[PDB]
Amino acid sequence: SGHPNGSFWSEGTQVGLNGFKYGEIPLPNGQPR
Amino acid sequence: MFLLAVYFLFFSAIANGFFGRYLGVRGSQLLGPSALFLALLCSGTIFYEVCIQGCSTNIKLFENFVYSNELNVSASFLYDPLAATMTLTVVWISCAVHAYQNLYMRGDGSQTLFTSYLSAFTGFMLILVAGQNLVMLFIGWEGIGVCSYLLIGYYGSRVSAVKSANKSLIVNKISDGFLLGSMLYLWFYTGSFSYCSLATFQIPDVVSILVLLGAIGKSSQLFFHVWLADAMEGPTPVSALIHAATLVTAGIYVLCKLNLHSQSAVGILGAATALMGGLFGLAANDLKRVIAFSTCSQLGYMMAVLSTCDDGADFAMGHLVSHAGFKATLFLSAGLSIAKENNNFLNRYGSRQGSPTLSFATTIASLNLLGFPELGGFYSKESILNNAYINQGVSIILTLATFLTAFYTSKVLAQLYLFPYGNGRQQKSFDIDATTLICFGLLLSEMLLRIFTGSSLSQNMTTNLPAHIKNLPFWVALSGALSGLATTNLFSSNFMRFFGNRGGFDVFYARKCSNVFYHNAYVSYTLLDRGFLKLY
Amino acid sequence: ADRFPPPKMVATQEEMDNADIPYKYRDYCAHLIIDFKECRYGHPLTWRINCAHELHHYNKCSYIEFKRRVAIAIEEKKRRGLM
Amino acid sequence: ASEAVLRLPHKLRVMRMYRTGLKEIVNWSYGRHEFYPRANALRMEFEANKELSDREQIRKLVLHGEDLLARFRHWEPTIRSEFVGGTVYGVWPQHCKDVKFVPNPAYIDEFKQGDTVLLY
Amino acid sequence: MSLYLFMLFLQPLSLSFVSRSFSKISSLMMSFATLWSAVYMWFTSNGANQTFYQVVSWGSDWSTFGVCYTSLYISLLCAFIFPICVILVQGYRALSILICIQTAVSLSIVSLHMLAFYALFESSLLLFFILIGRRKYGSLSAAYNISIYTFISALGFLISAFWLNWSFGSVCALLPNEEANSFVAFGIFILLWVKAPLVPFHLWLPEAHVYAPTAGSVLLAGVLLKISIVGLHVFFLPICASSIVKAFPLILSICLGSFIFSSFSTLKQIDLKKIVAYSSISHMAIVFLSSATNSGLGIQGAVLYCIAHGLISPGLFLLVGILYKNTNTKLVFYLRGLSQQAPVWWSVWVFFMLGNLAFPLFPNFIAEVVCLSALFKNHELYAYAFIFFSFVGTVYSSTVLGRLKGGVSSQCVDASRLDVISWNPLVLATVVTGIGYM
Amino acid sequence: VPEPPYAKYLANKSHYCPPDFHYSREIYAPYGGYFNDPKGWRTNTAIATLVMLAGAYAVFCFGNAREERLRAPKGWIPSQLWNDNVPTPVDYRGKVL
Amino acid sequence: TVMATSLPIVNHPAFLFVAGALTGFSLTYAITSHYVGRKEIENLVKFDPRYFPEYTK
Amino acid sequence: AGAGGPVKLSPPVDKPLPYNYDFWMDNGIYPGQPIYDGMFGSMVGNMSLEYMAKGWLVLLPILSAPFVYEHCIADDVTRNPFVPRQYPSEVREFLALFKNGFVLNDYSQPDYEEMKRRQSGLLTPIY
Amino acid sequence: HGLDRDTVTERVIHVAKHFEKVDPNKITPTATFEELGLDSLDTVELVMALEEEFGLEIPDNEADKITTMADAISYVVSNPLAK
Ligand SMILES: CCCCCCCCCCCCCCCCCC(=O)O[C@@H](COC(=O)CCCCCCCCCCCCCCC)COP(=O)(O)OCC[N+](C)(C)C
Ligand SMILES: CCCCCCCCCCCCCCCCCC(=O)O[C@@H](COC(=O)CCCCCCCCCCCCCCC)COP(=O)(O)OCC[N+](C)(C)C
Ligand SMILES: CCCCCCCCCCCCCCCCCCCC(=O)O[C@H](COC(=O)CCCCCCCCCCCCCC)COP(=O)(O)OCCN
Ligand SMILES: CCCCCCCCCCCCCCCCCCCC(=O)O[C@H](COC(=O)CCCCCCCCCCCCCC)COP(=O)(O)OCCN
Ligand SMILES: CCCCCCCCCCCCCCCCCCCC(=O)O[C@H](COC(=O)CCCCCCCCCCCCCC)COP(=O)(O)OCCN
Ligand SMILES: CCCCCCCCCCCC(=O)SCCNC(=O)CCNC(=O)[C@H](O)C(C)(C)COP(=O)(O)O
């Protein structure tokens, strides 16, 4: 438990999308929708 | 400067509830408490300017919020001595609860949304308190109602929690309907919604009854107290805020702001509520429910004191602001106890090694509840009891209520600390961080400052009473405490069962009122519009 | 009532307004409550220790006024024949 | 007594009475210290009548004990939090897999989404 | 005014010449252009001209069109809500029907001739009979209900208009006429009694809303119920005031009974669209009674509360339609866990449900305050009666919200980008009106 | 069941997330996910604080413009430092300060 | 035995009797107090020679 | 553990449903509940409404006994051993205006009757 | 947490010892309560004591089905809330 690195001011452990906004899947190469 | 606190709270609400994806759980755990700390500085400045130095301010945000023919209302804030005191108390308690929720709600999915609800909840309380006209008060009143609806029913997968939220919503709806009626009466015959022109020396009884009926809703009095006990379904930080300052106190604040109440009704209702709340808290076996019934009893004291004397409004407000502190402490310590023991029932609590700060805070808050001499609660409660001697009927009931309060307070203390360990042999633990310690330090500082600064100007003013009359509340509290420590039986099993069912107010509603409601619905729909008036 | 006449009112209307004394507190004791009010709000947190002389004087005058009220009650009750 | 208790056999009915009585001792107590003497007293109360063989007297005892256990049902049962009737039952229920999620919903036939009026 | 009328006539005209594959795009552009023309009509409407902001006639008494306070608000409301209906509806047939309905309804609002009002308003009689009775998702019973109710009420109104045209010689509003006859007053009244759903003539509205498409329901709730107040302020109160004051106890009896029994009937609903449709009926009674007081407060409050309803109920109907697309169900008992499964839809649903319960930061609050103030000006008990029984609405709204909020669900049913685009304007308008820009 | 292709775009379980707790990671909520802790949270909090203080400055200007004191304070008040419309203090006796 | 380990005095018969006597005295005094205190407040003035010379002898 | 706790799922309906099944609230977790607890089904503490009414019948006379004496049996002269607070004439005249005031009970005053009739004021506005 | 059989066996054996009649070697991982010498009323107390040991609530109908040392261990192992 505690904070991830033991420090409250450490970088977030979650990388990526928390969810899919409007249900849309991000394009692979970064192509705009 | 005066506007800043409401801005800080509503900014915390918007930031955590709409951009919490970017901020994160840690981001809430900073932006919430920091913003409420800044609001606490602003509220302290307001308290010094208005209360101590007697400088009321009016801020008109904009005019013609509703402008239809003669009906004209504006969004204005007037910080008068009552408003500054309630603002300071509310912001102090809310900053403490926001510090508390950082560790308590870490195991909850939506901590950001919880923080956002808490901050908008405080903001609507400050809108209610600081409004210069009746419409701003109604805005804050409905805002706290909806925020309570969204906070009690936070656990949506529990049928009990959502039904509790529905109960709160419906009861509060009836109460504000009565208030809206009284508001319309006062606008029609006084010419305005502002409290300054609101003053009437003689008011017809209908307006007084409507005001009282509206007030007894949020300040849960008898026949309107059903929602407070069920409000335990929500998370512990919600219970502390609703019982300490935001919801329960609002009716008392409205009754003190506009002195249209009648002495006969308020005293009887308050004394009855105090006695019934103490009797109900006697039977209860959840830690959290006993404290809610004690909140009911203290509300009964505050409502009763209005009938006694001209200073009754000041005494009620002083007990209000004193009560917020130790009651909030009692809920926060109870919530920590539940987390550490994974239990809600008083039987299985017991002596166990813990933090000295939490046990001391619980002890001092319970001592303030009991009436222990030379404490902030003691003065604010003796100011009520001693001044209620003139109303013989009220005084007797309040003294028995003091006995009952002492009994269940001492019983809870013995069961939590003095009693042997009652829970099972399993690994259970809740380690407390420095933030929770800062929370309890803030509550303890409020309690300590209350002694030095006082609650009312006439707190230590002499009530010309014989000594045996004046010191009687102490003896009744001591006898109640001694009987509570011995855990003696006070009532027969039939009356204990009656009190455990809280007087059967809800069972009457179930069996008669709800059944009649749905039979009216059956007649209206099935028999008539989908029956008689529907073609084959 | 006539037997126990009202005392002289030391505090005047302009002084009571200047001290912002509510009408409920204007009860032949108003000058002493002006003293107590100014000293209490002068000392926000030490008034309990510092402001004890003014509170004592106010309580004393209030006690005298309360005795006058009880005397009036007894006189009226004996006039009606209840005692 | 409920129908389910009545349909039970004699041995299990007396067992139910003992179990419910012990639980109600737990509910009506103020602490674990009260429990043990009261549990021994309930023990002795059942042991006193165990050797009776007269069916009619035994029926009388069972019925009276069932009435007593019905009257002394506690308003607030002491239930562990994680079980049915507990505070933490259903707070954040574990969400199951195999969830039907529609990806890129607005881009499925984007131009022609809407309601149509079909006629004969 | 002339630009607005020309654009209203242009929208049905364009459909005849479009490619039948560009129909949706052209219809959306035409709807937005009509909205802009309505904004222009508001710009060219000077408040200095107190009686009528603008009056235009095109060669006859029937072709007399004009805007007043009520007409201008209602016309802006319909022009605001039409584009949302346009995007929700697919197919040349459906587009044609909805465009013709909107043209007729929007011409009715600005009409100043009772006979022309009748002619334009009832031109949309078969179009709803076909629309609500569409092949797969429509019900013939509901279409029969709505068509017959409208026909009988409008024919009574037409008979009263004929009597006025015979006696006075004119039936235009701009010519001052007064009548004390009760038969003509009832003939005009019956249309209002039916069109504004008022017990016991409210049975058509529920069946119509449930079996109408989402665009159809949005138009019906948004502006077709409001046509009653245009008729009341324009064609009943100026001429039939003596009868409304003579029958005021009866008017209050019927209005308050409608409020109470519609609230109780709402409690017995298991279908979301039916819940919203019955909430509309309970909401109409306050409007009708506030106008009937014939006071400055009542008229303004009624038109304001109509605007509030025409911003809140279309949103609820739109959200329910979106949920039905995602789930193929409207039964509350099937729908559970929507808070966890659809947080974005749930937020807007709760926001609009709070709006329907008339909470302060919503336009319904200001509108209700004004209407209740007018009722209190008439009598205290009148306002007290309405204020108390408002608690019935809270019970059914709270029960619905609690049933939807939590439970176990295995389906992610949340709105797409198109859906959010659909309700964003309504949310913005609701907020803007709620802060006082009524 | 083999995780769908879009699972790569979805983020992991946070440190605060209990290991037993399962949630659908595809659901989007404006208040955040089930346990959040996004990457870059520190910069977002700094930006939020900057916006808060800027809005506080604007609100402070507005309030100071609209703060009306029509009765003189009994003593010196902190508002005198920043607002010039405060009436000169008069004490309980009546003497001006 | 209520609290054997921590506060054994509660189980003592003397503690129970003192607590019950305090309960009874405080509760019954609460009712009879009104008559009593009203009598002393009257007697304070009635037997004060300055206020009422006649009653004093 | 607050999150992830096991739950029981309510069985799916397998028999014809009663017409008033809307009185039952079931979210899918096993312990479904009535719309209002106590409307039907198990009663908390096995106490009926008759029992609660009898208990209230026992309580009300004892609770009402303190109030009935002062309000009804007692009279202004005999309620308290003192008269209301005495004020200067200018203050007393203003304070006597308040219908909810405490100087309206001053029987020493020569305006006692009018003050008492003011205290027992109008039930509803006349206009 | 799924608790392994070996620990559950140790704790059920530990609970079973406290009955005075039961002799400390007769209790085995597979033994019925009758051979241990336990009566029906005793089995009630043992089932309850198992409830405190593993911090669980045994619904009553399953409580009847527990008559052996073996099946009690099986029931505790089955329970995912057993501590
Ligand atoms: C007064 C001037 C300043 C105004 C500021 C107001 C304070 C914030 C206002 C934000 C907009 C208010 C309406 C927000 C949408 C209403 C829905 C909502 O509030 O919550 C949504 C979702 O919340 C959101 O996503 C947006 C909320 C952002 C901030 C909300 C603050 C509280 C709302 C204020 C109350 C409105 C006042 C209306 C009456 C005066 C649903 O929540 P639950 O039903 O509890 O379920 C959540 C899941 N769980 C079971 C785990 C709890
Ligand atoms: C998905 C959403 C995510 C984004 C969330 C957005 C967050 C919104 C922020 C909430 C805004 C709260 C501001 C409330 C004040 C309303 C603003 C306003 O009305 O502007 C006023 C100007 O007044 C102001 O600027 C107020 C200053 C706002 C800041 C004051 C302190 C902030 C504390 C909030 C307390 C507000 C309570 C008011 C209750 C009604 C217009 O002035 P006039 O020219 O007189 O307009 C005529 C009046 N009428 C509108 C009625 C037609
Ligand atoms: C001097 C004269 C003295 C008085 C004489 C009176 C004689 C009777 C006059 C009655 C006139 C009213 C006409 C309406 C009749 C009711 C509708 C017919 C019922 C019906 O079955 O229609 C079905 C559906 O209609 C529906 O679904 C509609 C439901 C009912 C409509 C509600 C009626 C409108 C509102 C009533 C009052 C309005 C205000 C009155 C001032 C469709 O039948 P089908 O097409 O399948 O054909 C198959 C043939 N079985
Ligand atoms: C029973 C409760 C009443 C139900 C109505 C509820 C509220 C509706 C009020 C609408 C407001 C304006 C309508 C004007 C009056 C309509 C009904 C008023 C009540 C009423 O019937 O009064 C009658 C007079 O009206 C009349 O003589 C005509 C009555 C209406 C005729 C019905 C159908 C007319 C259709 C005509 C179509 C258009 C024709 C145009 C040429 C008799 O009362 P009284 O004065 O004789 O007193 C004798 C008592 N002892
Ligand atoms: C301190 C200030 C006052 C606090 C509240 C005090 C309330 C006192 C009212 C109760 C005392 C008088 C009761 C009436 C006498 C009845 C005595 C026998 C009761 C009885 O036989 O029938 C009961 C009727 O319910 C009833 O008796 C309902 C009558 C209640 C009148 C409404 C007053 C509000 C009550 C709210 C709280 C009281 C809860 C307990 C009543 C149970 O009926 P059943 O269900 O067996 O019928 C069968 C279903 N076919
Ligand atoms: C909170 C308040 C608690 C309420 C407590 C009230 C409870 C009432 C207790 C008194 C009621 C009784 O005695 S109910 C006693 C009923 N009497 C009999 O059944 C006689 C026949 N006994 C047998 O058949 C067996 O010995 C048997 C005992 C079944 C066991 O079987 P084992 O031989 O294999 O152990």
What CA–CA distance (Å, rounded) separates E7 from E424? 25
Beta strand extents in chain F (DSSP E only): 67-68
CA of B117 to the centre of ligand 1 (A): 7
Distances (CA, A) of D104 to D108, E346, E418: 7, 20, 11
The neighbouring-strand residues paired with B294 are none
CB-CB contact of D33 with G4 (8 Å) = yes
Helix axes B134-152, B111-130, angle to 10 degrees: 160
- To which H or E segment does residue B407 belong? helix B392-413
Residue B507 and residue H70: Cβ atoms within 8 Å? Answer: no
Burial B341-364 (b: 16+ CB within 10 A, else e): bbbbbbbbbbeeeeeebbeebbeb
Residue (of B292, B321, B302) closest to B383 by Cα position = B302
Q: By three-state DSSP, how is residue E64 classified? A: strand
Task: Measure the CA–CA gap between E183 and E170, rounded to whole angstroms.
Answer: 18
CB B105 within 8 A of CB B237: yes
Alpha-carbon distance values, C33 to B52, B161, H95 (Å): 16, 52, 19
For ligand 2, pick from F28, F61, F62 the residue to mutate: most ligand atoms within 8 Å of CB. F62
Structure tokens belonging to residue B338: 């539940």
In this structure, what DSSP letter does residue E133 have?
A: T
Residue of chain H nearest D74, judged by CA positions? H45
* Residues whose CB falls within 8 Å of the CB of residue E8, separated by 6 or more in sequence, listed in order: E34, E103, E106, E107
The separation between CA H103 and the C-alpha centre of its own chain, rounded to angstroms, equals 27
Q: How many CA atoms lie within 13 A of B418 on its CB side?
A: 21
Cβ pairs bridging F and H (under 8 Å): 9
Q: In angstroms, rounded to a whole number, what is the distance separating the alpha carbons of residues E277 and E297?
A: 27
DSSP E56: E
Smallest CA–CA distance from F72 into chain C, residue: C18
Please answer yes or no on whether F9 and A26 come within 8 Å at the CB atom.
yes
Q: Match 């503690």 to its residue by tokens.
A: G15
Q: Report the first-to-last Cα separation within chain I, whole angstroms.
A: 7
Please name the residue that has the structure tokens 């901590």: B111
- Whether the ω angle into residue E200 lies within 30 degrees of 0, i.e. cis, is yes
Q: Sort out which chain D residues have CB atoms less than 8 A from I52's CB and list them.
A: none
Chain D neighbors of A28, CB-CB under 8 A: none
Q: How far is CA H44 from CA D102, E78, H41, in A?
A: 45, 54, 10
What does the block give as tokens for H26?
A: 């079931």
Tell me the C-alpha distance between B5 and A18, whole Å: 32
Q: Are B333 and B327 in contact (CB under 8 A)?
A: no
Q: Is D104 on the interface with F (CB under 8 A)?
A: no
- Rounded CA-CA distance B121/E145 in Å is 47
Q: Which residues of D touch I56 (CB under 8 A)?
A: 80, 83
Task: Give the span between the Cα atoms of G39 and G33, in whole angstroms.
Answer: 10
| CB contact (8 A) between residue F29 and residue E341 | no
| Paired tokens of E343 | 């947080």
State the Cα–Cα distance between residues D69 and C54, nearest whole angstrom. 66
Contacts of B415 (CB under 8 A, 6+ apart): B346, B347, B349, B350, D30, D31
CA–CA separation, B516 vs B524, rounded Å? 12
Q: Which of H100, H102, H103, H106 is nearest to H120 (CA)?
A: H100
- Structure determination technique employed: cryo-EM
Interchain contact H22–E (C-beta under 8 A): yes
Residues B362 and B440 sit within 8 Å (Cβ to Cβ): no
Dihedral angle of Cα I42, I48, I52, I58, to the nearest 10 degrees: 150
Tell me the helices (H) and strands (E) count for chain I, helix number first.
5, 0
Cβ(H102)–Cβ(H96) below 8 Å: no
Chain F residues lying within 8 Å of C30, measured CB to CB: none
Across the interface, whether the CB atoms of B524 and E373 are under 8 A apart is answered no
CB atoms within 10 A of CB E324: 16
Check pocket membership of E186 for ligand 4, CB cut-off 6 A. yes
CB proximity list for E417: less than 8 A, separation 6 or greater: A22, A24, D105, D106
- One-letter-per-residue 3-state SS of B91-149: HHHHHHHHHHHHHHHHHCCCHHHHHHHHHHHHHHHHHHHHECEHHHHHHHHHHHHHHHH
Alpha carbon of E299 to ligand 5 centroid (Å): 46
Burial class (CB in 10 A: 0-12, 13-18, 19+), F76: middle
Backbone angles phi, psi at A11, to 5 degrees: -70, 145
Strands E54-57, B71-79: pairing is: unpaired
Catalytic residues of I: 39
Give start and end residues of each alpha helix (H) in chain H: 49-68, 76-79, 89-97, 112-119
Closest to E255 (Cα-Cα) out of E312, E187, E197? E197
Nearest CA in chain H to G40: H81
Is there a contact between D101 and E412 if contact means CB atoms under 8 Å apart?
yes
DSSP per residue, B29-93: HHHHHHHHHHHHHHHHHHHIIIIIT---EEEEEEEEEEEETTEEEEEEEEE-HHHHHHHHHHHHH
Interface size between B and D, measured as CB pairs under 8 A:
57
Tokens for G46, please give them.
């009635």
E350 close to ligand 1 (CB < 6 Angstrom): yes
I44 by Cβ neighbours in 10 Å (0-12 / 13-18 / 19+) ranks as: buried
Q: Which amino acid is at H29?
A: I
